[PDB]
Nucleic acid binder design. Structure first.
Ligand SMILES: CO[C@@H]1[C@H](O)[C@H](n2cnc3c(=O)nc(N)[nH]c32)O[C@H]1COP(=O)(O)OP(=O)(O)OP(=O)(O)O
Ligand SMILES: [Zn+2]
Ligand SMILES: [Zn+2]
Ligand SMILES: [Zn+2]
Lengths: 257, 44, 49, 67, 48
RNA sequence: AACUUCAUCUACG
């Protein structure tokens, strides 16, 4: 009647990728951890843009869109920063946001590639993952881009600009033994990388009593958060959602009594 | 207001009820020039 | 794999990169509603368009 | 018009890779080999660079409205 | 209700202005309905 | 507290 004790084994750990395996866990818990990876890990991204002068070919809201999609280093202070709704101050302040500035003019004849490097942050911890560079616009001679931006904490449920991850690879039952997928012709199907079968055997024998366990994850970071801390923050955020749910549930049960 | 010229790209100030001709080029197509008030764009 | 539950979809699904076009017909241009609006002079009936 | 930041399907940053892609194509690399060198693995990300048409260069030919 | 003589037109009914509204443009001008122009022609010929 | 008509053409299911 109680929760199982899950186990984690990390196979690969690189600045861009974490490959790990979670065993003795439910499919629902595993899938929802993946789901939180994608949508419920807080990150910092530009959400306020004010363009003083835009003589580039791209219109203002195009530039704003591209600026929002630019990743920003959010390793440490995203936990410290508050949401704009939570912050007491009106509009935005150093606690709820980070300010960026762009002042580029193409005085020279050669085309000026405005990059993420040209974005200058008021706080050193958030930088546009520059330490090539993301190209915001190309400026012909006599064309100028000037803008001020504010970056706020948020998660990917709001907007895909706040996705901390690129691709979450989730696989269970590498050799089809639970028959969750029924191949019409099993031999035509390529083997998984995690498959332990011999080359002759296309599918493992049907396990009637089996349950999905030993889930395999490959989480690729977008560079804003380290791939390890994406997973840690996802676990902590899911735990916090459950705890908030429990608090509200206890309050309503007390109210009913 | 101040209207930028279509061809020579030089700002010229034209009063109301005045013919639309840029000084020093004579082009008859002017552009109103961007507003001072600033509009907030959500990056979304 | 099913996005909501994580279980493998039993029938393997045909996926690939196909070229798609956004046609000019958009819902915002077509949504319309009328409630005691402007009325024609000759017929004194609701207007058209 | 300009290389999109982030692949639509997954979200890996592809915006910084267009100039390097063009340089590697100039080197001798085939499109596939350049895409591999840039690190693009999934066909979703390779579609972003492979199918991209850079119109910003054609638009930059026209003279700016204000100089 | 209908005598054969009444079929021959000796008096022409002129419809009310509701039937033939005056189409106004910008207050600068007032176009007249086709019926108004035809009635003007009829009145001119009748006066002649 | 509030903007005509004709005519044509082009699209939509
Ligand atoms: C199925 O019948 C409908 C209706 O009868 C109505 N309709 C459409 N055009 C007209 C018209 O000119 N005059 C009248 N009176 N009715 C009309 O449209 C018909 C079908 O037309 P379609 O054959 O193109 O439908 P796809 O089979 O093409 O559907 P996809 O796969 O594109 O969604
Ligand atoms: Zn604040
Ligand atoms: Zn001029
Ligand atoms: Zn991709």
């Amino acid at each position: 009647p109680y929760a199982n004790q899950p186990t984690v084994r990390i196979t690969e750990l690189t600045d861009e990728n974490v490959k790990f395996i979670i065993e003795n866990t439910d499919l629902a818990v595993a899938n929802s951890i993946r789901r939180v990876f994608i949508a419920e890990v807080p990150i910092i991204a530009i959400d306020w843009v004010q363009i003083d002068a835009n003589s580039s070919v791209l219109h203002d809201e195009f530039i704003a869109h591209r600026l929002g999609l630019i990743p920003l280093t959010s390793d440490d202070i995203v936990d410290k920063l508050q949401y704009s709704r939570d912050c007491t101050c009106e509009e935005f302040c150093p606690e709820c946001s980070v300010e960026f500035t762009l002042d580029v003019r193409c005085n020279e004849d050669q085309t000026r590639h405005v990059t993420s490097r040209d974005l200058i942050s008021n706080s050193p911890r958030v930088i546009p993952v520059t330490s090539d560079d993301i190209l915001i616009v190309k400026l012909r001679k006599g064309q100028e881009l000037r803008l001020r931006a504010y970056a706020k904490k948020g998660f990917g449920k709001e907007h895909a600009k706040w996705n901390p991850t690129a691709g979450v690879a989730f696989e269970y039952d590498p050799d089809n033994a639970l028959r969750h997928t029924v191949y019409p012709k099993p031999e035509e199907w390529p083997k998984s990388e995690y498959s332990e079968l011999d080359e002759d055997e296309s599918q493992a024998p049907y396990d009637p009593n089996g349950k999905p366990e030993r889930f395999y994850y490959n989480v690729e970071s977008c560079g804003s958060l380290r791939p390890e801390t994406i997973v840690l923050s996802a676990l902590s955020g899911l735990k916090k959602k459950l705890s908030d749910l429990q608090t509200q549930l206890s309050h309503e049960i007390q109210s009913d009594v | 207001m101040i209207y930028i010229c279509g061809e020579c790209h030089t700002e010229n100030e034209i009063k109301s009820r005045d013919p639309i001709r840029c000084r020093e080029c004579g082009y008859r197509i002017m552009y109103k020039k961007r507003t001072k008030r600033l509009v907030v764009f959500d990056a979304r | 794999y099913n996005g909501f539950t994580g279980r493998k979809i039993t029938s393997q699904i045909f996926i690939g990169p196909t070229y798609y076009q956004r046609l000019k017909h958009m819902v915002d241009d077509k949504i319309h509603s009328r409630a005691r609006g402007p009325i024609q002079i000759l017929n004194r009936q609701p207007m058209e368009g | 018009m300009i290389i999109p930041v982030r692949c639509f399907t997954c979200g890996k940053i592809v915006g910084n890779k267009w100039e390097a892609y063009l340089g590697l194509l100039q080197a001798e690399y085939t499109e596939g080999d350049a895409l591999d060198a840039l690190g693009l693995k999934r066909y979703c990300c390779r579609r972003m660079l492979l199918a991209h048409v850079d119109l910003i260069e054609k638009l930059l030919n026209y003279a700016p409205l204000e100089k | 209700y209908a005598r054969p003589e009444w079929m021959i037109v000796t008096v022409l009914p002129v419809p009310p202005l509701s039937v033939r509204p005056a189409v106004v443009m910008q207050g600068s001008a007032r176009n007249q309905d086709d019926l108004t122009h035809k009635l003007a022609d009829i009145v001119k010929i009748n006066n002649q």
